[PDB]
Design a protein around this ligand. Structure first.
Ligand code: 7VT
Length: 863
C-alpha cells in the first residue's frame, strides 16, 4: 500500500497519463488487460529475480556482436580489476576467447600480488570501461562490436574484470519490491442520428458505409439518404448489406464516412462487429468520429477520446437472437473445414499452378485454380500461404473454415514470410497467431532490427489483448535493450489520441515487470524535461541577443543545481550501453537553424575517450522519418557485412521521444562538406582550387601513410551512400547535409525527404568526391573503377533482399508518414531495386544510371 501508491504515481509520470483515467473509462476490455498483463509481467519479474549470473548478463547487457559472427592478428588490451586503479596492458590474438584474456589477467594479478589465487576465469565477466557493455561467451575477440571498432579506430580496449558476486549484487539491487451459422438474415444496422456536425448549410449530409475484412470489401458499400446540414442530423433508417449474418468473419469491421454533397469529407468511424470476448454486438452505440482532412478501413476501431467536440454518429446494432451469439470455437470451426472434398488435378493444370506461384496480382480464372489446389499448395509450396489466403473468400464461412483447417496443419514459415503475414491485408486472428509462431524463432538481434515495424503493427490491432502484444512484452521483459526501445517507441506516440490508450497500457504492464527500469527511464524523461525547458530559453533568447551571448545565457542556465542534477549520470535513450556521466557545460552549444537544436556534450573519467559523447536535443521537427531512413541504411550495412562487404557506414542514433521531440547521437570529429569547403585563411587545409579543399583536410587529419587508408574509408562510404540514397530516393542533397569524419568516412544527415519526394531521384555523382577517390588526380580509372565495382556489388546484394525491404516498408505504412502511406511510395523501391528483372538485366539498367550520373558529373569537371 505504502509503496504501491508511490509506484503508481511514478508510472503515471513516466507515461505522461494518470492511471486514474484508465479506470474512469469503466471499460471491461481495458480492465481485463490491466489484470492479465500485470499477472504476465510480475511472473517475468520473478523469473528474472532468480536468473543465473550469466543469464542475468544476457538480460541486462546483451552481446553486441558483428553481423558476420551472428548464427591471426596481434591486439594490445588494457585490463583492470573492479575496485583498483592499477591496470595491465598485454598483447593477445584477435582469435582468443574472453576466457583466455581473463585467465591471462588472473595470472598477471597473482604474480604481482604474490598469491596463488582461489578465483578462476570462469567466475568473471569483462566489462567495457564506463559502459553497460560486457564481453562474455565463447567468441573470439574480433567478433565483438567493441573490439572490432577498436581495431579500425586504432584504439586500445579497456576492460574490467567483474566477479560473479558483483554481477549477482546488481541483480539483487534491481529486485522488484514484494450458433452464428444459423442466422441467414442479411446484415443490417439502424443509422439513428448525428451530433455536433459542422458542415456547409447549402449542402446535404450523407453516410456511406462498407463492411470490411481488412483491405477487402465483404460486400458492396451502401449509402444513406440525403438530409439537410445541421448540428443534429436525423435519419432513423435501416441499411442492408449483401451478406448473411452467418457469413460475417470474426475480424469484420463496420466502416462509416460522414460527408457533404452538392465533395467535402467531414468525419470517419469504425468498429468491430464482434466484441473482444467474441460476442456479436447489439444495442445502441455512440461513435465519436475522427476528422477527415472515402471510407477508412485501416483506421482505429476505438472512438475519438475528445467527447467535448467530436461529431457523434448514433447507430443501433439489431438483436439477431433472444440469446447472445458468440463466434464459434476453434473446435467447432475445424470440424466444418475438416470435411473438404479433394479432386484429381491434371498434369497440364499442375504446370499452370507452379508457374503462377513462383511468379504479383492474379486473374479471375487463376484464383479459381489456386483455391482448388489449396492442398497441393500446403504440401509442396507452403511459402505461397499468403497468395492462397488472398484467394480465400472471407465473406463465405465454408471457405474460411476450409482455409483455417489447412492453416492448423501448415508448416512453420521462414521469418521473411511471417513478416508478410503481419500486413493489414491478413486480419484473421489465427493468421496473425500463425505468423507470431513463425516469428518466435527470431533472434534478439533480428527482433531488434525489425522492432520499429512491429510497433506500427500494434496500431492495426482490433483488440487490446493480442498475441503480438504478449510476444513483444515477453521479449522486452527478457532483454533490457528491447525493453528500453519498446518503451521509447510507445512513449513517443503518447501525444496521438488514437494510440494513447493502447500504448499507455502496454507501458504500464512493462513497469509492473521492471520497477528498477522504470526509475532508469524516469531519470531519462526528467533530463528531457530540462532539455525542453533549456531549448525554449534558447528559442526565445537567440532572437534578441547574439549567438555568443545566448551561449553563456544557456551555460548559466545549465549550471543551476536543477540542470546539473537532471542532465548528469543517466543512461542514453539513444543507446542504453552509453552512460551520460558529466555534462561538459562549456562544450555545449546549439545550431543556428530554425529549431535551434541543442548540442549537449558529456565526458566520463571511468570510460576515458569512449566516455566523451554528444546528444542533440531537437524540438519542433518530426524525427520519425529520419529514424526510419537511418534504420534502413543500417539494415543495408548489416546485409552487406553478411556478404563480407564492409562499406564503412555511419548509422548514428536518432530517437523520437515525444511530440516533435527527440535525440540524435553526435558523431564526433566530423564536419560538413560546406564547412570544409569554406576554404578559410591561416588554417592547415587552405587550397589553390576548391576541388582540393576536402582532400587537403583529409591530408591534415591523416598524415603520411594514414592518408591512403583515409581515401579508401572515403571511397567505400561513398559507394555505400550513393547506393543507399539512390535505392531510398533521398533527395535534397547539398554540402550542409553531407558530413565527413576525420577518419575519411563520409555520411549523410537530414533525412526529411525520401522515396522520390513526387519525382524519380537519379543516381548522383559529385566531382568533388570523384577527385578524392582519384587521390587528387585528373585521370585514375584504376581507383575510379574500384569504386564503380563497390557500387555494383552493394546494389546486387541489396536486390537479393528486396522482398525484405518491401515487407518492412509495407508494415511501416501504419506509422502515418506523409511520404509513406500508399503503394505509390512502395513503387519507388520496386523501380530502384528493379525487382521484376533478372540479375544481368537489372545490373545493365543500373550501369546506365551510373553512366548517366558520370555524364552529369563531367558537366562540372569541364568547367
Ligand atoms: C537533421 O538534423 C540533424 N541530423 C544529424 C545531426 C548530426 C550531426 C553530427 O553527428 C551526426 C548527427 C545533427 C542534426 S541538427 O544539428 O539538428 N541539424 C543540422 C543541420 C545541418 N548541419 C548540421 C551540422 C546540423
Amino acid at each position: 500500500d505504502r509503496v504501491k501508491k508511490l509506484i503508481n504515481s511514478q508510472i503515471s509520470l513516466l507515461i505522461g497519463k494518470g492511471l486514474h483515467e484508465f479506470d474512469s473509462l469503466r471499460d471491461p476490455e481495458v480492465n481485463d488487460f490491466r489484470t492479465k498483463m500485470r499477472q504476465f509481467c510480475e511472473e517475468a519479474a520473478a523469473h528474472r529475480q532468480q536468473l543465473g549470473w550469466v543469464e542475468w548478463l544476457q538480460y541486462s547487457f546483451p552481446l553486441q556482436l558483428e553481423p558476420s559472427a551472428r548464427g591471426n592478428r596481434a591486439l594490445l588490451v588494457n585490463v583492470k580489476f573492479e575496485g583498483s586503479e592499477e591496470s595491465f596492458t598485454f598483447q593477445v590474438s584477435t582469435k582468443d576467447m574472453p576466457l583466455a584474456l581473463m585467465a591471462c589477467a588472473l595470472r598477471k594479478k597473482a604474480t604481482v600480488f604474490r598469491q596463488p589465487l582461489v578465483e578462476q576465469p570462469e567466475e568473471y565477466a569483462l566489462q567495457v570501461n564506463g559502459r553497460h557493455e560486457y564481453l562474455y561467451g565463447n567468441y573470439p575477440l574480433c567478433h565483438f562490436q567493441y573490439i572490432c571498432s577498436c581495431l579500425h579506430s586504432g584504439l586500445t580496449p579497456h576492460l574490467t574484470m567483474v566477479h560473479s558476486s558483483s554481477i549477482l549484487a546488481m541483480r539483487d539491487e534491481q529486485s522488484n519490491p514484494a450458433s452464428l451459422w444459423s442466422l441467414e438474415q442479411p446484415f443490417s444496422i439502424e443509422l439513428i442520428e448525428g451530433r455536433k456536425v459542422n458542415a456547409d448549410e447549402r449542402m446535404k449530409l450523407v453516410v456511406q458505409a462498407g463492411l470490411f475484412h481488412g483491405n477487402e470489401m465483404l460486400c458492396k458499400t451502401v449509402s444513406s439518404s440525403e438530409v439537410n446540414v445541421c448540428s443534429e442530423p436525423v435519419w432513423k433508417q435501416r441499411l442492408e448489406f449483401d451478406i448473411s449474418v452467418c457469413d460475417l468473419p470474426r475480424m469484420a469491421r463496420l466502416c462509416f464516412a460522414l460527408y457533404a454533397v452538392v465533395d467535402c469529407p467531414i468525419a470517419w468511424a469504425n468498429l468491430m462487429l464482434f466484441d473482444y470476448k467474441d460476442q456479436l454486438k447489439t444495442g445502441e452505440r455512440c461513435l465519436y468520429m475522427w476528422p477527415s482532412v472515402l471510407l477508412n478501413p485501416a483506421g482505429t476501431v476505438r472512438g475519438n477520446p475528445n467527447t467535448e467536440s467530436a461529431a457523434a454518429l448514433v447507430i443501433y446494432l439489431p438483436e439477431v437472437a433472444p440469446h447472445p451469439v458468440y463466434f464459434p470455437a476453434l473446435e467447432k470451426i475445424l470440424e466444418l473445414g475438416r470435411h473438404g472434398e479433394r479432386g484429381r488435378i491434371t498434369e497440364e493444370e499442375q504446370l499452370q499452378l507452379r508457374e503462377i506461384l513462383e511468379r504479383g496480382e492474379l486473374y479471375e480464372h487463376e484464383k479459381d485454380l489456386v483455391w482448388k489446389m489449396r492442398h497441393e499448395v500446403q504440401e509442396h509450396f507452403p511459402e505461397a500461404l499468403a497468395r492462397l489466403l488472398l484467394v480465400t473468400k472471407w465473406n463465405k464461412h465454408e471457405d474460411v473454415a476450409q482455409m483455417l483447417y489447412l492453416l492448423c496443419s501448415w508448416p512453420e514459415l521462414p521469418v521473411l514470410s511471417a513478416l508478410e503475414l503481419l500486413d493489414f491485408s491478413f486480419p484473421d486472428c489465427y493468421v496473425g497467431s500463425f505468423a507470431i509462431k513463425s516469428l518466435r524463432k527470431l533472434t534478439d538481434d533480428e527482433l531488434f532490427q525489425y522492432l520499429l515495424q512491429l510497433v506500427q503493427v500494434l496500431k492495426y490491432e482490433s483488440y487490446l489483448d493480442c498475441e503480438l502484444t504478449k510476444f513483444l512484452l515477453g521479449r522486452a521483459l527478457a532483454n533490457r535493450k528491447i525493453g528500453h526501445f519498446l518503451f521509447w517507441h510507445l512513449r513517443s506516440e503518447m501525444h496521438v489520441p488514437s494510440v494513447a490508450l493502447r500504448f499507455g497500457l502496454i507501458m504500464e504492464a512493462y513497469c509492473r515487470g521492471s520497477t528498477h527500469h522504470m526509475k532508469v527511464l524516469m531519470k531519462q524523461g526528467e533530463a528531457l524535461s530540462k532539455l525542453k525547458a533549456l531549448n525554449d530559453f534558447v528559442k526565445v533568447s537567440s532572437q534578441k541577443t547574439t549567438k555568443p551571448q545566448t551561449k553563456e545565457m544557456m551555460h548559466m542556465c545549465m549550471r543551476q543545481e536543477t540542470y546539473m542534477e537532471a542532465l548528469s549520470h543517466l543512461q542514453s535513450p539513444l543507446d542504453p550501453s552509453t552512460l551520460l556521466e558529466e555534462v561538459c557545460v562549456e562544450q555545449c552549444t546549439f545550431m543556428d537553424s530554425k529549431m535551434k537544436p541543442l548540442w549537449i556534450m558529456y565526458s566520463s573519467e571511468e570510460a576515458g575517450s569512449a566516455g566523451n559523447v554528444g546528444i542533440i536535443f531537437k524540438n519542433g521537427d518530426d524525427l520519425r522519418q529520419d529514424m526510419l531512413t537511418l534504420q534502413m541504411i543500417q539494415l543495408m550495412d548489416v546485409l552487406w557485412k553478411q556478404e563480407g562487404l564492409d562499406l564503412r557506414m555511419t548509422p548514428y542514433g536518432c530517437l523520437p521521444t515525444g511530440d516533435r521531440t527527440g535525440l540524435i547521437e553526435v558523431v564526433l570529429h566530423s564536419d560538413t562538406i560546406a564547412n570544409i569547403q569554406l576554404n578559410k585563411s591561416n588554417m592547415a587545409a587552405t587550397a589553390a582550387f576548391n576541388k582540393d579543399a576536402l582532400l587537403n583536410w583529409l591530408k591534415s587529419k591523416n598524415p603520411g601513410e594514414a592518408l591512403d587508408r583515409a581515401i579508401e574509408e572515403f571511397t567505400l562510404s561513398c559507394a555505400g551512400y550513393c547506393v543507399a540514397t539512390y535505392v531510398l530516393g533521398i533527395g535534397d542533397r547539398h554540402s550542409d547535409n553531407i558530413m565527413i569524419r576525420e577518419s575519411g568516412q563520409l555520411f549523410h544527415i537530414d533525412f526529411g525527404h525520401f522515396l522520390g519526394n513526387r519525382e524519380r531521384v537519379p543516381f548522383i555523382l559529385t566531382y568533388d568526391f570523384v577527385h578524392v577517390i582519384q587521390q587528387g588526380k585528373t585521370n585514375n580509372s584504376e581507383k575510379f573503377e574500384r569504386f564503380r565495382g563497390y557500387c555494383e556489388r552493394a546494389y546486387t546484394i541489396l536486390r537479393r533482399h528486396g522482398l525484405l525491404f518491401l515487407h518492412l516498408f509495407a508494415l511501416m505504412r501504419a506509422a502515418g508518414l506523409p511520404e509513406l502511406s500508399c503503394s505509390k511510395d512502395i513503387q519507388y523501391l520496386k523501380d530502384s531495386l528493379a525487382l521484376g528483372k533478372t540479375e544481368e538485366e537489372a545490373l545493365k539498367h543500373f550501369r546506365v544510371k551510373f553512366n548517366e550520373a558520370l555524364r552529369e558529373s563531367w558537366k562540372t569537371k569541364v568547367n
